[PDB]
Structures are given as structure tokens and as C-alpha cells.
Amino acid sequence: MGSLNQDATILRQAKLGLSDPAQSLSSWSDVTPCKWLGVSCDATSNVVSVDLSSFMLVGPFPSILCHLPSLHSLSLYNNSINGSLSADDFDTCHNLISLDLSENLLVGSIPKSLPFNLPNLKFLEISGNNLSDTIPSSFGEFRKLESLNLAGNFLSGTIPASLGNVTTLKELKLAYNLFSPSQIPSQLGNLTELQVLWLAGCNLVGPIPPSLSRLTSLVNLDLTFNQLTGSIPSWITQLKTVEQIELFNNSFSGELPESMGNMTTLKRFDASMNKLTGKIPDNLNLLNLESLNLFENMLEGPLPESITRSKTLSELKLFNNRLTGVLPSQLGANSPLQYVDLSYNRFSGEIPANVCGEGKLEYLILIDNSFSGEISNNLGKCKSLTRVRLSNNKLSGQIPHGFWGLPRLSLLELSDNSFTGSIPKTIIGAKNLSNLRISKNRFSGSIPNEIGSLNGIIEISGAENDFSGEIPESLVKLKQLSRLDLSKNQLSGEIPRELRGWKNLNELNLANNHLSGEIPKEVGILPVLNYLDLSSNQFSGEIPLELQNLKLNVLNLSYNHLSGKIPPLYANKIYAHDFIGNPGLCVD
Amino acid sequence: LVPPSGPSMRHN
Ligand SMILES: *[C@@H]1O[C@H](CO)[C@@H](O[C@@H]2O[C@H](CO)[C@@H](O[C@@H]3O[C@H](CO)[C@@H](O)[C@H](O[C@H]4O[C@H](CO)[C@@H](O)[C@H](O)[C@@H]4O)[C@@H]3O)[C@H](O)[C@H]2NC(C)=O)[C@H](O)[C@H]1NC(C)=O
Ligand SMILES: *[C@@H]1O[C@H](CO)[C@@H](O[C@@H]2O[C@H](CO)[C@@H](O)[C@H](O)[C@H]2NC(C)=O)[C@H](O)[C@H]1NC(C)=O
Ligand SMILES: *[C@@H]1O[C@H](CO)[C@@H](O[C@@H]2O[C@H](CO)[C@@H](O)[C@H](O)[C@H]2NC(C)=O)[C@H](O)[C@H]1NC(C)=O
Ligand SMILES: *[C@@H]1O[C@H](CO)[C@@H](O[C@@H]2O[C@H](CO)[C@@H](O)[C@H](O)[C@H]2NC(C)=O)[C@H](O)[C@H]1NC(C)=O
Ligand SMILES: *[C@@H]1O[C@H](CO)[C@@H](O)[C@H](O)[C@H]1NC(C)=O
Ligand SMILES: *[C@@H]1O[C@H](CO)[C@@H](O)[C@H](O)[C@H]1NC(C)=O
Ligand SMILES: *[C@@H]1O[C@H](CO)[C@@H](O)[C@H](O)[C@H]1NC(C)=O
């Protein structure tokens, strides 16, 4: 009765200083306090823990809760706790083990007296607020603290060296603050129990200090978005339990350490956006590897064959390097490969047949290589694929019949290869297709009528091929179509007179075909057309006067069989190059 | 509020 009375009173007093518009604390306003929402008691009915996470509470920090004599845990995570923290706010909180104030609206400085008022803390989080001034040097005085998270605030100055005394620390998160340009303090090497060090976006400069080799329990090292320099130290290779190394977007140079391949515990490695030179290490036995990212470096050599030992590898992005040679034939066969971007390298040889072996492959990006040969029929059955960019390679042969109608395929970019054949009527199946980009190839046959059913399509770019027959009347009823480029082909016939469906059409480019008849009147009514190229055709008759409604970047009706008079808007001599090569055409 | 500690999803 007594410790229930005391505690119910303390909790209700706390509640009256907060505002609760979602009515999260209705259960506080007949029943025992130990069964109220967010409230936990020990066996003698004393409140031990108060967890109000995600309760939409608004108001100052309810320091009255610290008057609860057995309170060890307080969470106000993800609320709208506002104002600043006073010294006095934690006067009575000396029993607390856990304090979580992350995701609120706190402003002002962290109190310097906090460690004196909170001597027993193990877990302190104030992540994602608007805190400012410096991290107090007095933080070195915590004798028990295991996890410190001040990530995502506006804290200034430099990371205090005194933090190195807090040798009970297993996690230190200071990422995403406004520190002055400075080095990683050497004293942080004292924190030999650290498993997580997250100093991303902390304006760090210089090398990773040598003293951090003493952090042999690191599981996660994350130093992304700094200007760190020097080698990636090879002692990361002899971390027995390392799972994640994140170094994206620094100025690291030299080579990846050669011994990397023996890091069996490693799940994720990212050293992208650096100045790394040399090769990818070989004799890789990276068994637990899920993700490797080395994009935007100056790496050279092959992708080693021993990457196929990584049977859980799902993400591989090495784009924007100087990588050479042929890729492992067995790549993907025994991996759940999901995202693969090897663009802008100097790879050669064929694309592995079983790259989508386990059916998980979504992105296959290989822009700007020298890949050769044909696309496997296995890829043509890879229904997981959403994004496919194979442009600017040495590829040839015919595309698999199933490859044009994969359900989730959004981008099919094949341009600037030697691909042959006709586009099959199985393209009807590609219900999510936005962008077809097949310029500069050697395709032939008709453009299928089935394309018109794909209501998503915004782009049909198939310039410089050998397409023939008429343009399907289907293509008019594609409300979302933006760009139609079928220039430099063998297309014959006319344009449909009815074009009101093309509300979003911006570019229409049909130059260098065998097209005929008059230019439809409704081209001038099209509300967002800026590009119109119908030159090098056999278009005859009078130029419609409705084209004067348009503001065009490009207007080219040259080298046709046109007749009559040029519309008066385009009468001036600067437009004259747009109409040359037409027998029966003059200016007034 | 805060980006997660993990890989970059920059791709072409
Ligand atoms: C990878 O490399 C670096 C990280 O080392 C990174 O460069 C940084 O990017 C930020 C923002 O992306 C840039 O900082 C800018 O600073 C100027 C003022 O000096 C302003 O234009 C911006 O600051 C304002 O930000 C708020 C608005 O968002 C405002 O409310 C506020 O009042 C500020 O005035 C802007 O943030 C700068 O170029 C660097 N900064 C540092 C510290 O390095 C680069 O962007 C990263 N690139 C990639 C691809 O990852
Ligand atoms: C922070 O709290 C808000 C409010 O409780 C959370 O928003 C809710 O999110 C869930 C989905 O997880 C939905 O069921 C609710 O409809 C959302 N409500 C509102 C008002 O947006 C939010 O998820 C929490 N954020 C975090 C990071 O935990
Ligand atoms: C906490 O900081 C953020 C970022 O400075 C503030 O949120 C918004 O910031 C952008 C500019 O980055 C403005 O366009 C918005 O209008 C800001 N919201 C406002 C002024 O309400 C946020 O205000 C800060 N919170 C507090 C309590 O100071
Ligand atoms: C209008 O289009 C025609 C082609 O239909 C352009 O003429 C070609 O110009 C290029 C210049 O690189 C030459 O290589 C070709 O030999 C030309 N072809 C013919 C048949 O003459 C013309 O220059 C375009 N004009 C404008 C103003 O866009
Ligand atoms: C806390 O939030 C409420 C409403 O969102 C506001 O009226 C009140 O004055 C805030 N307190 C501070 C110190 O900003
Ligand atoms: C804490 O570390 C600072 C600087 O790193 C040092 O000067 C001080 O003596 C240390 N204090 C204790 C109590 O360890
Ligand atoms: C990898 O090899 C080096 C010796 O060349 C060693 O220091 C390191 O401990 C090895 N790593 C593992 C995880 O065994």
C-alpha cells in the first residue's frame, strides 16, 4: 500500500507537467501503478523502470520522475520533450542505470554536472536532438558507463580526450555533430573494451591513430564522412570479432591490406569514395561477407576468383575503378546476389551465366566496360530484376525471349552494343517498365503493338538500329510517355492523326527514316513538346500553322518533300537552317 | 534524425 501510494503520486505529478494529446497515459489518470502503461515494478511494488517510448508527449523533461527512489531506467525515446536540460534536472536521479532521451526536441548544452548527478549510469543516449556547445570534459568521470550515444545533434568543439578514462565503455557513438576539424584523440585507444565506435561526420582529419590497435574487441568501426588520411591500417585484419568496417568518403590511400582475406567474421566492408590504389587482396576466405563496396577508388587488377567462397554475399559495388580481366564464371551461382554495380571499369569477357543463380538479383549495372559475347538464358528467367544497365559494352547476339517481359523490370538499358534480332511480343509481360533504352544496336523487324499496353512507359529510345514497318497506333495511348526517339531506322508509313493521349510527350525524334504523309495538326496542341525532329524523311504537304503554339528547343523539318509556305513565326533567317532541303517550300 | 551505421546505397 505505502510504496504504491508514494509511486502513484510521483507518477501523476510527473504527468501534469507533460502534455499528452494522443492520451497515451490514460491508465495513469482504480488500478495499481505497477500495471500502468510504461511502468515496471520490482516484487515490493517500487517503480524500477518507466518507459514512455513513442508516446507523443510534449513538454519539459519530467524530472519529478527521479523522485521515485528505486528508478533505474528512464526512457523518453521518440517524444517531443523540449527545452534545455538544467543541472538541477538530475539532482535526484542518482540511482539511474539507464537514461534514453533520444529523438526529442532538446536544445542547449549538455550539463557539466551530469556525471556527478548520475554516477551509476551504464547507458546514456541523447541521440537526435538539437544539443549544442561542447561535450563536457567531466564525461571522463563516469566510472560505470557502457554505452554513450550523442549522435545527431549540433555539438561543437572537439571530442574530449578525457573520454579515454571511461574504460568501461563498450559503445561510443558521437556521429553527425558539428565538431571543429580535429584528429581522432589518441586516448580513445584506452577504451579497450569497445565493440562499437561510430565517429561518422565528425570533421575528423589525419590518420587513424596507432593507439586504436588496442581496440581488439571492435565489431563495428564506422568513420564515414570524414577527411581521414593515410593507409587503412592492416591491424583491422587481426580483429578477431570484427563484423562491420565503414570508411566510405574519406581520403584513405595506399592499398587495401593484403591480409584482409583471412577476416572470416566480416559481414560488411565499405571503403568507397577514397584514394585507394593497388589490387583487391586475393585468397579471400570471407565466409560471412554480405556486402563489399569499393566504388570510386583507383583500384586495378582482377576481381579474384576466391570471392566465390563468400556464399552469403548479396551486395557488390566496385564501380568507378580501373579493374581488368574476366569475372569469375561461377559468380552468383552459390550467392544471394541482390545488387551488382561494376560500372566504369575495364572488365572484359562474358557475363557469368548463373549471376542470378539463387534468384535474388535486382540490380545488374555494368555500364562502360568491355563485356563480350551473349546474355545467358538463365538471366532471361531472373524475375527478381528491376534495374538492368548494360550500355557501352562489346555485347552481341540476341537477347533471350523471356528477358523482355520480366514483371518487376523497370529499366532495360541495352544501348551502344551489337545486339541483333526482333523485340518479341513477350514484352507485353513487362508491366513495370518505365525506360527502354536500346539506341545504337543492330535490332530489326517491327516495333511490337504490345508495347502500347505498358501504361508505365515514359521513355522509348531506340535510335540507330534497323527497325521497320509502321509505328504502332498503340503508342498514342501511352499517357505517361515523355521521350520517343526512333531516329536513324528504316521506319515507313505515317504518324497517327489522333495524338491527344500524348499529354506528357516532350521529345519526338524520327529523323532519318522513310516516313510519309503530312505532319498531323495535333502536334501543335501537345502541351509540353520542346523537341521535334522529323528531318531526312519523305514528309510532304503544308507545314501546319499550329506548330506556332509551341516553344521548341529543336525544330528540324529539313530534307523532306514538304511544300507550301513556312509559318510566319518561323519566317526569320535564324530559323532557316530548320527547313533546308525541301523542294516546294519558300518564304514570303 | 540520424542516418544508420551501415553501407552506402549510392549506385548507377
Ligand atoms: C562526402 O564528403 C564530405 C564529408 O566529409 C561531404 O562534404 C560536406 O557536405 C556538407 C553538406 O552535404 C557541406 O556543408 C555545407 O555548408 C554550407 C555552409 O558552409 C551550407 O551550404 C550547408 O550548411 C547548412 O546546412 C543547413 C541546411 O541543410 C542549414 O540549416 C545550416 O544553417 C547550414 O548553413 C552545407 O551543409 C560541405 O560541403 C561538407 N562539410 C563538411 C563539414 O565536410 C560531402 O557532401 C560528402 N559527399 C557524398 C557524396 O557523400
Ligand atoms: C515515433 O513515434 C511515432 C508516434 O508513435 C511513430 O509513428 C507511428 O509509426 C507506426 C509505424 O511503426 C504507425 O503505426 C503509426 O500510425 C505512426 N503514428 C504517427 C502519428 O506517425 C514512429 O514510428 C516512431 N518512430 C520511431 C523511429 O520509432
Ligand atoms: C532542430 O533543428 C532543425 C534543423 O535546424 C529545425 O528544423 C527545421 O530546420 C529547417 C532548416 O534546416 C527549417 O526549414 C524548418 O523550418 C525548421 N523547423 C522549424 C523552425 O520549426 C528545428 O526547428 C530545431 N528544433 C528546435 C526545437 O529548435
Ligand atoms: C536537321 O537534321 C539533318 C539530318 O536529318 C541534319 O543534317 C545532317 O547534319 C549532320 C551534322 O553532323 C551531318 O553529319 C549529316 O550528313 C547531315 N545529313 C544530311 C542528310 O544532310 C541537319 O544539320 C539538322 N539541322 C538542324 C538545324 O538541326
Ligand atoms: C514545448 O512545446 C510546446 C508546443 O509544441 C510549446 O508551446 C512550449 O512552449 C515548448 N517549450 C519550449 C521551451 O520550447
Ligand atoms: C582523465 O584523463 C585526463 C586526460 O586524458 C587526465 O588528465 C586525467 O588525469 C584523467 N583522470 C582520471 C581520474 O583518470
Ligand atoms: C590474418 O593474418 C595476419 C598475419 O599475416 C594476422 O595478424 C591476423 O591475425 C590474421 N587474421 C585472422 C582473423 O586470423
Domain that holds residue A363: 1-588
Q: How far apart are CA A510 and CA A558, in angstroms?
A: 12
Q: How far apart are CA A23 and CA A266, in angstroms?
A: 46
- Scan for cell 537477347, then name that residue: A399
Q: Are strands A370-373 and A205-206 parallel, antiparallel or unpaired?
A: unpaired
Smallest Cα distance from A477 to chain B, Å: 31
User: Is there a contact between A127 and B11 if contact means CB atoms under 8 Å apart?
Assistant: no
Q: Are strands A39-41 and A47-51 parallel, antiparallel or unpaired?
A: antiparallel
Q: Is the CB of A107 under 6 A from ligand 5?
A: no
Decide: A56 in ligand 2 pocket, CB within 6 A.
yes
Interchain contact B4–A (C-beta under 8 A): no
Distance CA A260, CA A235 (A): 10
Question: Across the interface, which of B2, B8, B11 has its CB nearest the CB of A176?
Answer: B2
A128: left (phi over 0), alpha (psi -120 to 50) or beta: left
Query: What are the φ and ψ backbone dihedral angles of A325, each rounded to 5 degrees?
Result: 85, -175
CA dist A105 and A131 (Å) reads: 9
Q: Which 3-state string (H, E, C) describes A422-479?
A: CCCHHHHHCCCCCEEECCCCEEEECCCHHHHHCCCCCEEECCCCEECCCCCHHHHCCC
Pairwise CB contact (< 8 Å): A175 & B5: yes
Contact partners, residue A537, CB within 8 Å, separation at least 6: A510, A511, A512, A513, A514, A515, A516, A559, A560
C-alpha cell recorded at residue A51: 518507459
* Chain B partners within 8 Å of A152 (Cβ): 1-2
**Distance between CA atoms of A500 and A479, rounded to whole angstroms?**
9
Q: What does the buried/exposed string (b/e) look like for A357-387 if buried means 16 or more CB atoms within 10 Å of the residue's CB? A: bbebbbbbbbbbbebbeebbebbbebebbeb
Q: What is the DSSP letter of A128?
A: S
Grid coordinates given for A336: 544471394
Nearest Cβ partner of B5 from A103, A198, A315? A198
Instruction: Quote the CA–CA distance of A366 and A567 in Å, as a whole number.
Output: 47
Inter-chain contact A151–B6, Cβ cutoff 8 Å?
A: no
Q: How many CB atoms lie within 10 A of CB A136?
A: 17
| Cβ–Cβ gap A127/B2 under 8 Å | yes
Report how far ligand 2's centroid is from the alpha carbon of A55 (Å). 9
Cβ atoms of A475 and A446 closer than 8 Å: no
String of DSSP letters for A232-288? PPGGGGG-TT--EEE--SSEE-SPPPGGGGG-TT--EEE--SS---SBPPSS---TT
Question: Which ligand sits nearest to residue A106's alpha carbon?
Answer: 3
Q: How far apart are CA A441 and CA A298, in angstroms?
A: 31
- Residue of A552, A573, A544, A555 whose CA lies nearest to A587: A573
3-state secondary structure A525-571: CCCCCCEEECCCCEEEEECCHHHHHCCCCEEECCCCEEEEECCHHHC
Give the gap in angstroms from C-alpha B9 to the nearest C-alpha of chain A: 9
Q: Report d(CA A549, CA A176) in Å as an integer.
A: 52
Q: Residue A286 Cα, ligand 4 centroid: separation in angstroms?
A: 56
In short, whether A58's Cβ falls inside 6 Å of ligand 3 is: no
- Quickly count: other Cβ atoms within 10 Å of residue A479's Cβ: 12
Q: For A194-204, b where at least 16 C-beta lie within 10 A, e where not — what string? A: bbbbbbbbbbb
Q: Give how far A180 is from chain B: nearest CA, Å.
A: 19
> 3-class DSSP state for residue A67?
helix
**Residue showing cell 518564304:** A587
User: A485 forms bridges with which residues in the sheet?
Assistant: A461, A509
Q: How far apart are CA A248 and CA A223, in angstroms?
A: 8
- Residue A474 phi, psi dihedral angles, 5° rounding: -45, -45
C-alpha cell at A135: 561535450
A167 neighbors A144 (Cβ within 8 angstroms): no
- The C-alpha angle A289, A293, A298, rounded to 5 degrees, equals 135
- Please tell me the distance between residue A328's alpha carbon and the centre of ligand 2 in angstroms: 45
Structural contact between residues A214 and A188, judged by C-beta atoms closer than 8 angstroms: no
Ligand nearest to the CA of A177: 1
Give the CA angle between residues A386, A392, A395 to the nearest 5°: 85
Among all residues of chain B, which has the CA nearest to that of A78? B1
Whose cell is 558507463? That residue is A145
φ, ψ of residue A514 in degrees (nearest 5): -105, 35
Q: Is A221 helix (H, G, I), strand (E, B) or coil?
A: strand
Number of other residues whose CB lies within 10 A of the CB of residue A88: 11
Decide whether any atom of ligand 3 lies within 6 Å of the A105 Cβ.
yes
Side-chain-side CA neighbours of A440 within 13 Å: the count stands at 10
Phi-psi region for residue A416, left (φ > 0), alpha (ψ -120 to 50) or beta?
Answer: left
- Whether residue B6 contacts residue A272, with contact meaning beta carbons closer than 8 Å, is answered with no
- Residue length of chain A: 588
Q: Is the CB of A348 under 6 A from ligand 7?
A: no
Method of elucidation:
X-ray
Beta strands at A394-398 and A80-84: parallel, antiparallel or unpaired: unpaired
Could you tell me the CA-to-CA distances from A160 to A129, A268, B3 in Å, in that order?
20, 29, 23
Task: Fill in the amino acid letter for A460.
Answer: I
Biggest CA-to-CA distance, chain A: 106
| Cα A347 from Cα A325, distance rounded (Å) | 5
Spatial distance between the Cα atoms of A429 and A454, rounded to a whole number of angstroms:
9
Cβ distance B5 to A248 less than 8 Å, yes or no, reads: no
A75 HSE (CA, 13 A, CB side): 13
Instruction: Say which amino acid occupies A495.
Output: I
Distances in Å between the Cα of A144 and the Cα atoms of A98, A117, A121, A165, A586 are 11, 13, 6, 11, 91
* CA gap B9, A224 in Å, rounded: 13
Instruction: Output the CA A196–ligand 2 centroid distance in Å.
Output: 27
- Report the SS3 class of residue A130: strand
Cα separation, A126 vs A135, whole angstroms? 12
The domain tally of chain A equals 1
